[PDB]
Amino acid sequence: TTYERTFVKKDAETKEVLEGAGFKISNSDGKFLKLTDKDGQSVSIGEGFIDVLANNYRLTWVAESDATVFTSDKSGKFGLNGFADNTTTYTAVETNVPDGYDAAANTDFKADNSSSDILDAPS
């Protein structure tokens, strides 16, 4: 059994869904998520939810500068599956902020198969 997490990026005031908000995910060790293929090679992802399972990708933990950026799609959605447990705490860190917004505060989460909103304050 594996777990997933979804987020929806929204304007804090209007709740408009925001596209193109980019996030890195950190763990308690202060390392950041980098997806690889089964053979350790880098992969290209687009916006939205990433089906790690269907792609047989692997989760690895690297310096922030080397991490995968996960990006909200046109509906504001992003996330991934392939997490090993629902008990570990991670942090979603906004690194690429849409125009007209201030970054959301970092968001602690567990891979608990839920969806939650991440709010960007309009500038």
Numbering used by the authors: 176 to 298
Reported in the publication:
As the first reported host of “non-pathogenic-derived” pili, Lactobacillus rhamnosus GG is a gut-adapted commensal lactic acid bacterium (LAB) and one of many clinically investigated probiotic strains for human use in the prevention and treatment of certain gastric ailments. As with other Gram-positive bacteria, sortase-dependent piliation in L. rhamnosus GG (called SpaCBA) is assembled from the ~30 kDa SpaA (backbone), ~20 kDa SpaB (basal), and ~90 kDa SpaC (tip-located) pilins. Two immunoglobulin (Ig)-like subdomains comprise GG-SpaA, each having the conserved residues of a canonical E-box motif and internal isopeptide bonds formed between either lysine and asparagine or lysine and aspartate residues. Our findings show that the GG-SpaA structure has certain features in common with other pathogen-derived pilin-proteins, such as the Ig-like CnaB-type folds and the presence of internal isopeptide bonds6940.
As an alternative, GG-SpaA protein was fragmented by limited proteolysis as had been done previously for other backbone pilins. This produced a 15 kDa-sized fragment that can be crystallized in two different forms. Whereas the tetragonal crystals had diffracted to 2.0 Å and 1.6 Å resolution at home and synchrotron sources, respectively, the orthorhombic crystals showed diffraction to 2.0 Å resolution at both sources. In parallel, we solved the crystal structure of the tetragonal form with an advanced molecular replacement program using search models from distant homologs. As a pruned search template, the C-terminal domain of the S. agalactiae GBS52 pilin4 yielded an interpretable electron-density map for model building, though it offered less than 20% sequence identity. Refined models for the tetragonal and orthorhombic crystals (residues 176–298) gave Rwork/Rfree values of 13.9%/15.8% and 21.6%/24.9%, respectively.
